[PDB]
Structures are given as structure tokens and as C-alpha cells.
Amino acid sequence: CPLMVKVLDAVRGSPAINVAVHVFRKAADDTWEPFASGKTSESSDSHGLTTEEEFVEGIYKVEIDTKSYWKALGISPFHEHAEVVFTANDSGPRRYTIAALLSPYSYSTTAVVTNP
Amino acid sequence: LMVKVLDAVRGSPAINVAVHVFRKAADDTWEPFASGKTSESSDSHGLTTEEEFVEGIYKVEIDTKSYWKALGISPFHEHAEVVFTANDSGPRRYTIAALLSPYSYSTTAVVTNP
Amino acid sequence: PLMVKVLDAVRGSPAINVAVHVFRKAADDTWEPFASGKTSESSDSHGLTTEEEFVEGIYKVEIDTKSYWKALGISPFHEHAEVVFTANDSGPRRYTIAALLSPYSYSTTAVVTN
Amino acid sequence: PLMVKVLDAVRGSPAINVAVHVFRKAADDTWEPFASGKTSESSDSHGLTTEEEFVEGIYKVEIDTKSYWKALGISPFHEHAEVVFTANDSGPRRYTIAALLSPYSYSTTAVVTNP
Numbered sequence: 246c247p248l249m250v251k252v253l254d255a256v257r258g259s260p261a262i263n264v265a266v267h268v269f270r271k272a273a274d275d276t277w278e279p280f281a282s283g284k285t286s287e288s289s290d291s292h293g294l295t296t297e298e299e300f301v302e303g304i305y306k307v308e309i310d311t312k313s314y315w316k317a318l319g320i321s322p323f324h325e326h327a328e329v330v331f332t333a334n335d336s337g338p339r340r341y342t343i344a345a346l347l348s349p350y351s352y353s354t355t356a357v358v359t360n361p
Numbered sequence: 362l363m364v365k366v367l368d369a370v371r372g373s374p375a376i377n378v379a380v381h382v383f384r385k386a387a388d389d390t391w392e393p394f395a396s397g398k399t400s401e402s403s404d405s406h407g408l409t410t411e412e413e414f415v416e417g418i419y420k421v422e423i424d425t426k427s428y429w430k431a432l433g434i435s436p437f438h439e440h441a442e443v444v445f446t447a448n449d450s451g452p453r454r455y456t457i458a459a460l461l462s463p464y465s466y467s468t469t470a471v472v473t474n475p
Numbered sequence: 476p477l478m479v480k481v482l483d484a485v486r487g488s489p490a491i492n493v494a495v496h497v498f499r500k501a502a503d504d505t506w507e508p509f510a511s512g513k514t515s516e517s518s519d520s521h522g523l524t525t526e527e528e529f530v531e532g533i534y535k536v537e538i539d540t541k542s543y544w545k546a547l548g549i550s551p552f553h554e555h556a557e558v559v560f561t562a563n564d565s566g567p568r569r570y571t572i573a574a575l576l577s578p579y580s581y582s583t584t585a586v587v588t589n
Numbered sequence: 590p591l592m593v594k595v596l597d598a599v600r601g602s603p604a605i606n607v608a609v610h611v612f613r614k615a616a617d618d619t620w621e622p623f624a625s626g627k628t629s630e631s632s633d634s635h636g637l638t639t640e641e642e643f644v645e646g647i648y649k650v651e652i653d654t655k656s657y658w659k660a661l662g663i664s665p666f667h668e669h670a671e672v673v674f675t676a677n678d679s680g681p682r683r684y685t686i687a688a689l690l691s692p693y694s695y696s697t698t699a700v701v702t703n704p
Binding site for chain 2: 304323324325326328329330331332334346348350351352353354355356357358
């Protein structure tokens, strides 16, 4: 698939399941367009939210509700949420894997961009 | 509020990195709060702001993009941000440490009883 | 059973043809070969997947990150990337070890399933 | 010349009293102890500052991340965290190894300055 948002829980060493993820495309006057949304789910090595629509050149935003994830575990995380804002400047068809490694006081996000 | 930024490709502190701040408004939108850039001098490798810190939902942006472009590298992220609630339970001393690479970054909060 | 992913944080892509050797501890400072090979790429497969199953015990994953960088004209800080851990201490599990490489930095994450 | 700073990504604070054992590659390709220490906190200086000074060569820094996590009732993935590297290969330089820790993940970054 064209887009894969993986969310990992670094305390537990498991995919953070049931996490809300909102994907947005930038528009005129900072207007953010809703591109795709959903929640993390797994089966074998698929531990995230995937979408089928490819990414045409532009600026996208990925919102991850990391606050809600930690509250369910009785924890008040530092970050109010996780946000990944990037440019899909390669207009040609590309595959984007976006990962977020979560900890109560820290998060990491990594992107792997491959061209089929 | 302190913000330390490290460059993982050069193994040194991210020099002259732009950093902006935003205090949340009653419309769930943002309003500017503070600014500055990562200034280097010995062991001081971050941006140390002076502005006192009201309780409230904040947003710290680090212009990673401009930083990498200047190094002839085309980065993935437009920027690196950290949205956190600041002093909702007495004064707290914050230090936001960021580790940067063209395709990934980590932001870690170090909170301390002032 | 075991999957080792190696990513280049500077290019945002799998680091391919990277040598990975896995060992099992047999005594203080004594490692038995478990499996080895190179990161192979093909569509969504960007790492090294081994067929061998772990038995309970301590294992070491050696990743030759130095050769990867030298092949680029870069003299990296780390001589290699080692990952030592205890496996199956609670039963048959699937391990996915990820190593993210930057010339002056590297991070390793582990995802253990079911 | 050699400093080791460790952050706890779970508690959002430096990792205090983390054991750190530095070795030096021996002529016969072995590991001879080089430094002794535990992350000490004072002011914001939480890491460990070793007095010993190096000469060109390969070194190994082992951070007992496991004892740290166990003390917090958490069974971590790694037996430890280590950083092997060739130092002063092009002239004496100052090194600071920053380690960011979580039970199932960790990173180590080298901040090398030109004296």
C-alpha cells in the first residue's frame, strides 16, 4: 500500500493498538483538508493504519492521538499529541511508511520513503 | 523553557536552528508566545528563553527543514513540534531535547521541580 | 521468528546489503552462531528475516553499520551496532528488531508479538 | 574528554545512578577496563564525567540499562546498551555520549567537539 502509519509503544514493545490517526492535506490560507482517518489495528507484521490512495505532491499532516493512548493506561503524557508534518515533493508514485515510537515523555517519528 | 537540539548526521549540536512558540487561544487555534534560535557557546547548545511560563497548552516548533536545506539535504519533515501543557500543577522547569536526522527526530521532555 | 530492519535516517530508506550476524550466549563471553546474512530488499521487505526459532536465552544481533557508511565516504562514530537481549523468557514470541542509523547516532527498537 | 549522559524517556528526567563501565581495546584485541562510574546528578550535570583521558584507539561504553529498568519494576528488552567507537583518530577531541532510554528502545548519539 501507499501509506502506512505504524505506532509503537516503547514501554511495552508492542504496536499501540486503537490509536486515532488523522491525515491532512494542506490547502489555501492554512486550511487543512481531511485526507484520511482511522485507528491502529494488527495481524502479523501489519501493526498500523494503512490507506490506499497515493500521495500527489503537496504538504501533509498526520495527527496521532497519543494523549488518549496513555490516559487509558492511567498516565498523563507530556505531549498533548503527536503530529508529523511533511512534504510529498516527489510527485511520482511513492510509498510512505511513517512510524512513531511512543513513551510518556518522549516520541520519535521516522519516515521511510520508497519508490516501487 | 529550554530547547536543546542535536544534529545526528554531524555529531554536534544543531547550530543556529530556528525555534518558535505558540500559546493556545480560546478558539483552539494558536497565538505567538516566544522565539529565538539555537545559539552555541561551549556547553550551551540550545535556545534558553526568559519569558515566565503561564499554565496553558503550548506549542514548540523547530525549523528542521531550513536547517537541513542549508546542509544541502532535502529533509522529510516540514518541522519538529512539541505540544505540551506547561504548569498546571505548580512551577515546573522544562528542557525540550531534540535529536535530528533528515528523516526522523525525537523530542524528549525533561521536567523538573524548579 | 526474527526480523531485523535497518534504516538509513539520512535518506529515509532501508539500508540494504548490510551484514547482520546473530549469536546465542553459551557462557560468559562465548557466543554460538544462530544465523547471519544481509539485509535484503524487495517491495515491503527491507531487512533480514531468519527461519531459525529462538530457544529461551540471551541473544546478540551484530549489525555492520560501519561498512555501510564507509561505502559512502563517511567515517561513522560507531564501530558497529549491537543489540543484546533475552528472548522467550515467557514463551514463543516473534521479534522484530529495528536499527535506525545516522553517522553519529543510532537507535534500536524492539517489537515483540503475541 | 568522555562524558555519558542518560535520559529516562518514561519519567522525563535524567537517569540517575546508572552504571557505566568504559573499556579500551587492548593490543591483543581485548577489553581492558578504562573507567568506573554511575550517572551522578547535580545541577543539570546528570551524566558521568570521567577524569581519565584517552589516546587514539577503539573504546567501548557499556550502560547497565537493565538494572535501571528492573529497579522500576520493569523487565526491559535489552541486557544493556553499549557504544563501541574509534576515538582521537584525527586528533584529541571532546566526546559526549547521549543515551535516551525506554524499556524496549534506546538511542545513543555522539556529540564530538573540536578542542
